[PDB]
Design an enzyme around this catalytic site. Structure first.
Site, mmCIF file in Angstrom:
data_model
loop_
_atom_site.group_PDB
_atom_site.id
_atom_site.type_symbol
_atom_site.label_atom_id
_atom_site.label_comp_id
_atom_site.label_asym_id
_atom_site.label_seq_id
_atom_site.Cartn_x
_atom_site.Cartn_y
_atom_site.Cartn_z
ATOM 1 N N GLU A 159 0.640 -0.719 0.087
ATOM 2 C CA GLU A 159 0.226 0.008 -0.265
ATOM 3 C C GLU A 159 0.831 1.413 -0.395
ATOM 4 O OE1 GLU A 159 -0.651 2.592 3.351
ATOM 5 O OE2 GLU A 159 -1.021 -0.039 4.611
ATOM 6 N N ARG B 150 -2.392 -3.752 10.944
ATOM 7 C CA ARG B 150 -3.223 -3.860 10.302
ATOM 8 C C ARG B 150 -2.494 -2.764 8.633
ATOM 9 N NH1 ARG B 150 -6.565 -8.073 8.745
ATOM 10 N NH2 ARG B 150 -8.493 -6.621 8.486
ATOM 11 N N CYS C 21 7.337 -1.409 -1.926
ATOM 12 C CA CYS C 21 8.864 -1.744 -2.377
ATOM 13 C C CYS C 21 9.868 -1.628 -1.275
ATOM 14 C CB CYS C 21 9.855 -1.153 -3.468
ATOM 15 S SG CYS C 21 10.298 0.332 -3.914
ATOM 16 N N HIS D 107 13.243 1.069 -7.269
ATOM 17 C CA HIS D 107 12.008 -0.227 -7.076
ATOM 18 C C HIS D 107 13.359 -1.906 -6.928
ATOM 19 C CE1 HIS D 107 9.680 -4.027 -6.630
ATOM 20 N NE2 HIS D 107 10.579 -4.283 -7.780
ATOM 21 N N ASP E 109 13.421 -10.380 -4.559
ATOM 22 C CA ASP E 109 12.386 -9.299 -4.940
ATOM 23 C C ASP E 109 11.052 -9.338 -4.166
ATOM 24 O OD1 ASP E 109 11.072 -7.327 -6.104
ATOM 25 O OD2 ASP E 109 10.477 -8.505 -7.453
#
Length: 284
Positions: free
Chosen positions: A49, A74, A79, A116, A133
């Site tokens: 998120e 929660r 990344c 990333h 990853d």
């Protein structure tokens, strides 16, 4: 080197809270067997998120926050948040950890930012290099070896292809290919340039606080399972499966709270849902 700057602050990590949170259950040593489970548990346990960024708030990469958010709440992360936490654990378990950065392309063109987070990992069994990853949001749920693999291989039931090209200056340019909703496609590209936490902070400050960045605009959530992949891209809800097939749903703002709790295991205070539910982003 030895300066803590070149490592991943594994000390500051509550190894047990973390391993408990992702459901680890194997031997606590730096073996390929462990790495293959660490990656799987994490990718299939932690939500993806960009909510903090959409709420106008900052995204911090210190382990303190990363643990209170991803291990004790929660909530998920993207990344950098994901890789940063995973690196700490890896180090702790005695793994060889070094970082890399890739440019997501997803079939697009041009040259996108190298923002990333990727992890180049080495076990204690041999000299093979493993790419972890864990923050993309769509697996892979197992690490993939850092070697030429043009032929379709499978990490779990998801199909991939690792390609080794040459970029400017005769440098290595890797390309991971994933099979999905639109057939085969290039997920991203990456070099083998050594990357560190400081490099992630820059990348993270851009991804999270830049206008030029899509991540700061509307909600973007992913939840990854061994057999399915959920994705929330604005008000478009997508569920994808390993055979490429998939279905979608056009959601209404009022529908967001429930989908986000059940499908993304993300819990937010009312003010945030309210804020989410009526964000100027919807107008776009």
């Amino acid at each position: 080197p030895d300066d803590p700057a070149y490592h991943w602050n594994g000390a500051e990590l509550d190894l047990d809270a973390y391993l408990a949170r992702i459901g680890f259950a194997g031997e606590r040593a730096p073996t390929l067997a462990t790495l293959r489970e660490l990656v799987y548990r994490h990718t299939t346990a932690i939500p993806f998120e960009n909510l903090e960024a959409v709420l106008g708030r900052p995204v911090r990469l210190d382990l303190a926050t990363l643990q209170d958010k991803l291990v004790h709440s929660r909530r998920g992360g993207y990344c950098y948040e994901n890789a940063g936490l995973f690196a700490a654990a890896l180090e702790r378990l005695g793994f060889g950890v070094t970082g890399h950065t890739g440019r997501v392309t997803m079939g697009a063109g041009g040259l996108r930012p190298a923002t990333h987070a990727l992890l180049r990992v080495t076990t204690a069994d041999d000299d093979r290099v493993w790419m972890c990853d864990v923050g993309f949001g769509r697996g892979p749920l197992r690490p993939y070896e850092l070697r030429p693999q043009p032929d379709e291989f499978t990490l779990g039931d998801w199909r991939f292809r690792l390609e080794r090209r040459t970029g400017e200056l005769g440098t290595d340019l890797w390309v991971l290919h994933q099979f999905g909703r639109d057939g085969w496609v290039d997920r991203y590209t990456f070099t083998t340039a050594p990357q560190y936490r400081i490099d992630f902070e820059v990348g993270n400050h851009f991804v999270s606080t830049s206008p030029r960045s899509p991540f700061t605009t509307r909600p973007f959530l992913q939840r990854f399972h061994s057999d399915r992949h959920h994705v929330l891209d604005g008000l478009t809800l997508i569920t994808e499966r390993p055979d490429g097939s998939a279905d979608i749903r056009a959601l209404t703002p009022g529908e967001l709270p429930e989908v986000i709790n059940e499908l993304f295991d993300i819990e937010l205070p009312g003010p945030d849902l309210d804020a989410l539910t009526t964000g100027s982003w919807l107008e776009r």
